[PDB]
Amino acid sequence: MILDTDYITEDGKPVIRIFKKENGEFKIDYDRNFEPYIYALLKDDSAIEDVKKITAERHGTTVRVVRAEKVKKKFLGRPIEVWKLYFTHPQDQPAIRDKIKEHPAVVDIYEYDIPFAKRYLIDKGLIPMEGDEELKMLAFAIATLYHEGEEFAEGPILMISYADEEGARVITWKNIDLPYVDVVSTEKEMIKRFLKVVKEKDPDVLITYNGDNFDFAYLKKRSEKLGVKFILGREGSEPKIQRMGDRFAVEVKGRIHFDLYPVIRRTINLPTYTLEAVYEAIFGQPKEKVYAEEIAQAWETGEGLERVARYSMEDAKVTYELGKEFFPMEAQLSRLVGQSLWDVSRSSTGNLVEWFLLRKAYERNELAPNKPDERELARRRESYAGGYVKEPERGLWENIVYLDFRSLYPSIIITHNVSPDTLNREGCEEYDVAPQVGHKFCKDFPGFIPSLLGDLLEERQKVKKKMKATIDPIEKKLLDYRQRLIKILANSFYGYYGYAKARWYCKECAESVTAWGRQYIETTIREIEEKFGFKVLYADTDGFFATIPGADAETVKKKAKEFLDYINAKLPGLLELEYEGFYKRGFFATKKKYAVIDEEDKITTRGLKMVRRDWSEIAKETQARVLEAILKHGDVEEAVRIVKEVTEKLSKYEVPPEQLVIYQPIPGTVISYIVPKGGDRAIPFDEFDPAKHKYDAGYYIENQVLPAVERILRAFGYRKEDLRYQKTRQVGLGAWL
Template sequence: MTTGQLVEWLLMRESSLKGSIIPNRPHGSEYMARAGETYTGGYVKSPKRGLSENIAIFDFRSLYPSVIVTHNIDLSTLKMENCKENIVPEFGYCFETSSRGFIPEILKDLVGKRNILKKKLKENNDPVERLFLHVQQHALKILANSFYGYMGYPRARWYKRECAQAVASLARMYIKKVMTIAEEDFSLEVIYGDTDSLFVIVPENKRNVAIEFLEKVNADLPGIIELEYEGYYKRGLFVTKKRYAMIDENGKITVKGLEFVRRDWAAIARKTQEKVLKILLKDANPEKAAKLVREVIINIKERRVKLEDLIIYTQLTKSIKSYKNIEPHLIAAKRLKDGGEEVVPGMVIGYVIVKGTNKLISMRAEPAAFVKLENYDPDYYIDNQILPAVLRIFEAIGYTRDYLREGIEQRSLKGWF
């Protein structure tokens, strides 16, 4: 069951308990009309690219559910004209507050139950009970956060584009207002923001300012909307929106949107990227990181690497005959089968790209078991594995592909730090 189905099941149950009529699902032209309606989502502030230090992260606690509850956003409370209060920015319609809406009432209960569980979690030291409490509160978090998307889902029984549009609009307003307070009232630099969170430079000797900022914001926020302090990080590397890495005061590295978890990278690419990030975040030494990359490239050229680090693993999701496109793991699977191996859907195929005259890379994919160290194609692993895995990171701090690959000098890097 999807989270959207869980939301609908809960709404249907509560509606039945109240003796209310359950709306029908849309069909035909009604669904098509809904499917054509769009609205703008959350606000994302582009990051300050490169390395930054002393970063405090603040995020809104359950922002979308809190907005729905605080502003009483519901189909039954929507008012399209003659609005005097609780007006939605950008659009002008509003939501009445004289009586509690159906969805806000349910969400308020869910948010309250989750807050109780989180409080118990903080007070409990038993690992088993903590795990149980964490799972419960996390399930409620996912369910509560799904109401916003459900309101804008064309097949939903309780669909209303204006409601989903209002939630996103108000959320954008709050995150922008908080950023403005940070910059104008407290002279704090906001280097990144994404939907419900903001990343702020707070010098180590001015952490008290961060607390003052938090208290000021929460004193002004209405209803159950609340900004929380998520953590303090020694250093962060920001590449693009939703792609960054940070290290906290205990040396723990958090990576978002980069390639660590991608299965279609060989181990040598993943390991190199991980080492580069560690050097940049722990040592703040770009030149040391670039030197590491060039050393890996030299080792690949001179075949001073382990064969297992060059293997790429991809799952065969269907039978060989069902594939229409030529893909590396498919070619490797065919060669395994030709070699007498049993090949079935669901198998994870390990292959290595070898040297050859065929320009199509997929045709040079050999099963790992058939490959010797002298067979692999160094240029492929340098240009299609190592460099793509680290280039976006280095470009954010002013380094070029040529400098990494060949050591060719470029302009001064001083402006990046």
């Protein structure tokens, strides 16, 4: 199985190294015959003799063009004859490409910025992470001595922990009577001991949590300070540090440095990305955090070191567990895109699509367009119109169905052949015209991107069907990941079209997809209203909520199924409307803000409860009470009385202070405070005394309860003044009113 590729230079010549793992043994294959190249479009074939003599200089030695050969490729569907220019070394390309481009007879140059090792995988048709080879993995973590105003790695590494199938162990230079702790004499000996473990275990994968920007950098500075050659690589090399924009990334030659931090950052959405929060969300099990202060205090006092060593052990243990959970998915992503797991795990959506397209382009003899220059990039900053959002019909509705399109944007791209190579093509026999924007797309030949997108959707169906027949639960999980990743990649094509740095960028394509989307959703709405008598309550981008005001629950379901059969017979190509769900009740307050409930009493809220900007228990409790009264009881006037009851109790100081605590996640803990009657007046709840102090009733009414509930009750016509404690009316003659 192919792990990764790179190149070394031997006597000025590039040598590709292919790192492989076959039959449980590590192998390095060498290729000294891969020639780097660039394409050049000339306005005259006679000019090739002038461009062959173009020279540049790379570190004293003269850079020259080895040889040139005329090649026929496709560029934007149309055939193109371009000159394939060969070079001795890949580093010759950045040195000479500008001199070649500036030549008068050169119209343009192409594929001049593609990394040599990645160009090799594509050109040779090699796919990394292919096969059933089982990789040996090892996770590791470090604990350090931290002091507030000191430089990076000024304090020593206190402990180094590691974990695999054999379990988790901790290496330290202090006596700890724990079964999993290995004691050495010094920090220098601890680092040397860690190196021996990695060498003896010889793992194919090194798993870290933020090892790209902390662990490796800390180990490097300490090994330099102590005089230890940090040889982690399979060929005796030290970890190589690279720049990824504003941050860093670390390679370990011969192995795969799998940093879980950038992976989990993309895959899962969490409020915080501490190792503790991540583990608790993925495995549902708690993990205690031991802060830098506690670690430093324990090491200096020499007391409480059991707790520190256990935290160190758990760090390696959970990092191995998480690595075991995310690596197989990243392995399938690597195999799908066709690039190393190291790169795919650190790449964003735009880069993943681009690498996929670059490989496909080579397979189809398609000349790839260049990345945009600074001038062209500034031309691509202009935006376009997106999805359709209907202003909701206010009020409480009963028996609601949600209908939506299955893969609307990929379906549009395939159905209408939306692509830069089909856009306004001359001599069209058949074309589809995008509404509003008016862009014409030829249908005579399959467009490059729609063709690939169709193959992806077809391949996904072939893997969904293979899942049903696979008994092996490990293989079924692997197929599940491949299937999921194909859907993710397919849904990235639309965004890629409007991505200014994309090689295959096409604003006309991007806005045509959204224009067609707006047409299909609006056409479907007027169709269900005029021909089936439905009321469309709300709609957002590719779906809508509809109902028949005075109809039975079974009647609305029947009519919805009949409508689905009707419009699906009219829809072109891959476009298809789906049932999605039925809801007993629902209210649509404003665009992006609504709430519905199914027949099982499950409530779904969007744009309302989601607002987690410092909310007291009293505001959360009454919002839930309001939501329940409206959706489960269907009683809007009861929800009003609840708010009036709560504001009256708050104004008369009858609400206990425990229900007034506000939680704010900020050194890195949740602060619990209360607002008093005396705007920077807030105090921690621990110091609040009901016998000595009074809370701000006005604040909890006007800034807590009312804002949270008004956003819901505004849909029914209630203002903020319709919910406060209006107080008893002045009855009798004594009042004189």
